[PDB]
Amino acid sequence: FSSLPSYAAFATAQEAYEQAVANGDSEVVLKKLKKSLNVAKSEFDRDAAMQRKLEKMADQAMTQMYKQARSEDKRAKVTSAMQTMLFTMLRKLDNDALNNIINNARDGCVPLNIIPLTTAAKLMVVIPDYNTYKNTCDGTTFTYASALWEIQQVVDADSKIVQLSEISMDNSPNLAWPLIVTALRA
Amino acid sequence: AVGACVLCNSQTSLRCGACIRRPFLCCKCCYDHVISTSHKLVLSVNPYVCNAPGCDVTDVTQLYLGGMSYYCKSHKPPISFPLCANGQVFGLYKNTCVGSDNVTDFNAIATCDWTNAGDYILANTCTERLKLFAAETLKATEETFKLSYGIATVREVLSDRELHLSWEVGKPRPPLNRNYVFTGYRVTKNSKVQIGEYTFEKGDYGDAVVYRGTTTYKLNVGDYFVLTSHTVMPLSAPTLVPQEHYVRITGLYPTLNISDEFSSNVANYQKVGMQKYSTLQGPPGTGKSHFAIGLALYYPSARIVYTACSHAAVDALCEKALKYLPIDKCSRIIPARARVECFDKFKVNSTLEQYVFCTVNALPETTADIVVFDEISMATNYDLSVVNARLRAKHYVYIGDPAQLPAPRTLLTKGTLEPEYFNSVCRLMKTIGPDMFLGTCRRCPAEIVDTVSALVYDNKLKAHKDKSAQCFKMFYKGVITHDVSSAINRPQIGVVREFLTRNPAWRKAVFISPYNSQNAVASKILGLPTQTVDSSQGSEYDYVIFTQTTETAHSCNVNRFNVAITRAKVGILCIMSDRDLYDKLQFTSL
Amino acid sequence: AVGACVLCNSQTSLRCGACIRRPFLCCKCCYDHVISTSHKLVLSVNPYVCNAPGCDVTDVTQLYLGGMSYYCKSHKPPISFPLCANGQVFGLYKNTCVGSDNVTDFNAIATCDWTNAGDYILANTCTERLKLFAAETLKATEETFKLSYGIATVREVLSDRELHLSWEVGKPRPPLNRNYVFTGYRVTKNSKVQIGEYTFEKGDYGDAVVYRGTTTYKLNVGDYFVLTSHTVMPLSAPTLVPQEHYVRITGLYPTLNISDEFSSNVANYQKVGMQKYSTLQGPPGTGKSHFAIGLALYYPSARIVYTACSHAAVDALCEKALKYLPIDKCSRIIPARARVECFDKFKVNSTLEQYVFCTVNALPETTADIVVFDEISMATNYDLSVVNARLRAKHYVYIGDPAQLPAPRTLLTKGTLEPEYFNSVCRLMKTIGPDMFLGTCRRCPAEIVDTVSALVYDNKLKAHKDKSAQCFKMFYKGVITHDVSSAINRPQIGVVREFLTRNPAWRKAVFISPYNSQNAVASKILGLPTQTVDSSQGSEYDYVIFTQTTETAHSCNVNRFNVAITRAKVGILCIMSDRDLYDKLQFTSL
Amino acid sequence: NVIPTITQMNLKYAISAKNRARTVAGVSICSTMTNRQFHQKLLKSIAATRGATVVIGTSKFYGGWHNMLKTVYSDVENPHLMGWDYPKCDRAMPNMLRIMASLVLARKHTTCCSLSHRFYRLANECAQVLSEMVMCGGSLYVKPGGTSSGDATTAYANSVFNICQAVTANVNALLSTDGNKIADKYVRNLQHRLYECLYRNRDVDTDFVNEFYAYLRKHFSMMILSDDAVVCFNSTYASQGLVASIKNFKSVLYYQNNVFMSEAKCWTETDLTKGPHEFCSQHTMLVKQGDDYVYLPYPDPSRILGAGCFVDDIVKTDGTLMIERFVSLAIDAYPLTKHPNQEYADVFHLYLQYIRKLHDELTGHMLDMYSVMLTNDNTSRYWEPEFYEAMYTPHT
RNA sequence: CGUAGCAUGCUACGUCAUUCUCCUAAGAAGCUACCCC
RNA sequence: CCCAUGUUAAUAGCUUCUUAGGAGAAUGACGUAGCAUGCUACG
Ligand SMILES: Nc1ncnc2c1ncn2[C@@H]1O[C@H](COP(=O)(O)OP(=O)(O)O)[C@@H](O)[C@H]1O
Ligand SMILES: Nc1ncnc2c1ncn2[C@@H]1O[C@H](COP(=O)(O)OP(=O)(O)O)[C@@H](O)[C@H]1O
Ligand SMILES: [Mg+2]
Ligand SMILES: [Mg+2]
Ligand SMILES: [Zn+2]
Ligand SMILES: [Zn+2]
Ligand SMILES: [Zn+2]
């Protein structure tokens, strides 16, 4: 704006016109300097409007560039997090029995609903009340999915460990119900 | 994608895209770099190209930002801002880019093609970030030069293992050795699938190639092999961690009275316990590697990673450890490929063990105690950055000798490298002196060490041995073959095979000739165990048969000859070609 | 940021920024404060400065609001409103700011520099909010005075633990003791990183400093240590919770027939159960701390937090509890730093236990039952506010004696503090009398308590003991050293080391001299367990060796001498300096 | 390809009239990001066409309810309004009808994609909506069927299912008549051709399908919002049995939806000057606006008070922040003004007086907190009934 | 009477400032339908 | 001349507010073309 020479031309037109008015210059010279003041004001105003629109455009584009940089920086973070989750879930895979059943399959395609059922090392039974607990995992060992499981832990709703000797019919109401019982494959 | 400038470490989002390695640059640094060199392509979060589809103008000196895109002057929108302006180039964090006056070194590093010795000495006297960037772009240039090799189309299949090949004319044929791999292609007008990874060896007789493939597909005439290139990944860790002296030994627990032979090294063990990192320089065969073994013994409560640049060097380190260190804490990690023969006596590929041995490139990302880098002269700043990025540790020892032969640096061809610019650690050794220093040869007899004290080593050795009269010289020339630019001397091999009987104690001698093709040839005619000079330098043998093939710049370098001869534990017969080199040492005449 | 006025508790958003502690102020109060004192900087939600960039005028008496910013008269916009106007200063909630006439006390508190006794007595007779504000700004002034200490640059490293230092001239050198910490700096033309936190001790011989560092970095010549200051955080809770008498005991369940020795204290236990808070004043060694132990026994169903200002005082409380209370419900919480030696016999750092012992500053934010504050005289209103902010409880007991030595108050140097202005609780004790009172010494023999009844205590003690003939006096002067303005008397230490044998029962005696440097010196020459007088006052010993170093205003205060002598369970030898103080007590002559 | 897709099940937190927990199934972005792309053109063409049977996207404001209720009465003979309600609609819907909905909603792709592309889109919809893995509180279960309430095409798939049940009830009612009692000789021929086109004819018969669909839109004019239906069925035809009464819908829901729609929750209005009893949970009443009579939708006048007194977030308790919330509630509850009952009518004046008091106390607090009132305060129309009455006028 | 020049007034077009209206995009906050009776 | 201390979905509708762009209108300043009137030089 003020850095442009059009502002300087406006300033010198103003100076010349003010000097002519102070000196009481003739009407023809005063009209010529009024024309100079007008054309300087118009040119400088055009320059100022163009400069303002230029600054608006530049700070719109830098805003867009900040937004795109943030987007491309979030994409890389999500890709890294997704690869981390996939490789950790790979690390948890029980690569002996799972590989055995896959190499035992027809084309190597086993339905997903039997991938845990034959390879999962941990079995979380969830039991809503004592009447079911008597008929599903009574004792320290029970049979489910044609394999023998042994109780390792029994927790209640608020995750406070309950020993297996406290699950009795008379002691049933005092327990915090459904009991997540975690067992291991044997 | 934002980051830090590789010249002033300011926040920025520009990348000078004309560079092969594509480094970040601050705004002021990017302007000073694109104003001077021919680098005229800047990548912001989206590339600076004329977004008008009917244009191809990429130079950042004339591109104008309009709306939300960029245009040349011809497609300039009514409202537009010039990018290259008032000493800067428009980009993110424009107001906080502190400029730097070090743009000349960065221009010279990113512009030069790594051919003359000036580029390398510029790559070792610059700042830390410039050190890393120069090493990374040097590795990238090596990879791209590897990419420019020819394509090997077969002509016929000689046997199930023997193949007859022909390389495409117009591009130089890569030499045949175990390092270079190829991917095969089967063109049947469709289905150009990778048929396997093949490693090639020159045959015993005739223009024949013995191939070893990952796959077992039968080769046909139409299959052609193309060399594979490895994408060099960027590095972050500094070349040297900042030294921080400690008042007392930390992270270590010394053991009283470890042994009697390690008596003179106790003070140096305490010094290594003191400093954060330390350097040990000594003449060859002076216990530098065995010092690291005694260092492991002196601090038995330290999970030590021995790592080395070479392969047989780390294997010899494993052998020395098995000689001294208790076996059942040592492991030797080999890579997944492992196309070269490793040392199979420790529990292979056991990262969790206490005494872990590895090559630099195969190091696993781990925490550790004191880590010993072996043969620093063989390694470049890429290797030091890798070992300092993958192994986070509480003590670093760097052992090696500047007088030995350095890394190959295949790009370098004109001029010779001074020792002190081999890498950062060798510069440390030749600037302020080694932190520990021990020179007296416990390896070689008196005559060989006397000759090597008349050689490049200005006479300083005081070796504790006597003349065993087991050092022999020859002079005859021999014939050159120039197989793949790796010469083979058949009559010299024939004379060695002739000798071979008159002194039966040399039937267990080990063959030494750099010349990998001649090294492979020696495995057939006489069948002695053999080793090239570069994969040597860290092992030793009782009897050594050294054969100088050609009077070239390669096998007449004084460092290479010295490191070839000084592996002789009890004796060496060297058959020489150069009159001056043969006359410069004092063995028997023959 | 809105809040409540610290003078009238009206809603407001002004902060008189010239104050070091930056308190909130209502509009009328802010005008009355900036019109009188030199406080001419008011912070609203944005600071009242001339927002014209070419100006620096900050006084609120002449600033005019225009548009959405503020300007001076020179950059005044065409439309502007004067801020300081018609008895108010413009700010939020302008119509609901009820003024206050207490602005004189607030002016005097926030203006005075905490040097004369008038400021302190103004800090204890004002309102509650003014009490809190005065204590907080006093702590802030102490911190800023701590910040004005010198910088210790080393000259050479004597040993792995011994260092030779030099303090920067022009600022007074801080004294060397365990409380003051330093941060080290390594200036190598770059990378001014905190190299560690170091605590310094004066050496046994010579101008030497023994340093103990968190880090193990080896010191070099260029490293310099700078004292660290703690940012004093604002407090909210009142100094004293409002008393509310109860008709019957609530939150407690008394136990019949607790013991026979606690028989006379049953009524006081019931009184503590009755009131919300209560105060117990008694002469030293009259069971005041042991009363709290019997109080814990009398209400075994009460989660009791014992807290104390000192460290060895709370340790002696722990020891008394272990003597009487059952052990496996008591814990002793030490801070994360814990640079001073604590008492390690209870389960350390167990907040969840029933009988929790702690220092005031290390208290955890918790609910509790009846909480016993020990040695209230040692604590200031900041401590009472802290203990009343972190521990929410149903009964409060404050036990301690106004006659003992108060908090140090290092800022105070001219004039002497009357006892009744020590803090709020001591003012409560000396205004309306203690809620419980018991005077008869169960600690000291007859002669010492008779002397202390001839001392500051106007004769009231009726101690139940007889003259054990174990109280001894000396008169000789000794030599002064003035190490760090903490004097050491080497010949007096030598005479004590001389004595030491003629009466072997004093080889388990405990050394008493305030004089922390002399206390550290006593640990070397004769090796007796030692304790300064201030970290005393709550513990007791069978034989006490007390050494008066210098006839200064510090170690001749009658309170300090009384609290030093009255720790003698069976006997004390005091070597005196002042003729009048020595003649004022009746021990053996020697 | 096929992308199996976990969908989480969360519990909705919103005001409701009965204590059973409501669950909403959040479908993973891997399925939404393609279902939107495949279906968006149709799902925007349906929600931008006014005056059809699937009225989704016809605003109930701006005289839009009266246009709905006049495009229902599409010149039927002796109208009676009927409404049904599928019990457990989004859980007991058989898998076959979900496949049917996803086919009729994907018949438009006759040109853009090939056949196998359409089939793999059908398999992806039936693996990411119909029979998927439901993550229900830290555990993957298998959902046996029934549409999840959270995919891209939920309300429109339910609309297609609803029209399928309506037409199936009509087909059953037209077939199951005695045949010799159907005196209207055109209708008997229609039944005799309906049986042939159903069972004795393997390929389509577009002449007869067009004739029967014209029959349905002449005597069974319908209005659908995803399961909320209003039917304007001719009374004489229902009494004779030539059109689906309620009992036919009970039978059709019995043998096709596997539930029992008890006749205590499907209403029938024998008049028209009172409108449908309950459509879209907003009752309908006939008011006099300007010079003419228009239908107005008014909500259950207790739900508005329940939305006022209870707020799901504690910052909405403050009141003076939320005037732009009571404005919306008053807009929704304005038609209670003209209800003949008075205690209903007082709710709108309660909200008006409460907005006025809220703004009075807001300017009180913004005159105490600052020192100057707001400059351009434009809340003087929210407490005037003229704004809310303009909200239900046919101009815009 | 005409040409050239000057002054004044009146129309057409361009630049700037202010106001008003409409739409399109983007964003933020909220409600209802949904869910159950 | 010095001594205490660190804890919760999809779709749809609607209301309000902000920003950006476009279009149109109105008023005013300023500038270039056209029209008219008047003054001067020349024919
Ligand atoms: N103090 C010693 N006593 C006995 N043998 C030694 C001693 N010092 C070194 N040696 C021998 O010298 C050899 C030097 O080996 P090494 O350190 O591998 O040499 P370089 O470092 O040159 O490769 C070792 O094999 C070791 O047996
Ligand atoms: N009734 C009593 N019977 C026996 N000993 C008592 C009795 N009262 C007090 N004492 C003894 O007097 C000492 C006073 O200790 P303490 O309360 O710590 O004194 P102070 O409060 O002055 O620090 C206790 O150690 C206790 O053994
Ligand atoms: Mg070695
Ligand atoms: Mg006490
Ligand atoms: Zn570049
Ligand atoms: Zn830079
Ligand atoms: Zn272009």
Ligand SMILES: [Zn+2]
């Ligand atoms: Zn102030």
Ligand SMILES: [Zn+2]
């Ligand atoms: Zn006030």
Ligand SMILES: [Zn+2]
């Ligand atoms: Zn100013």
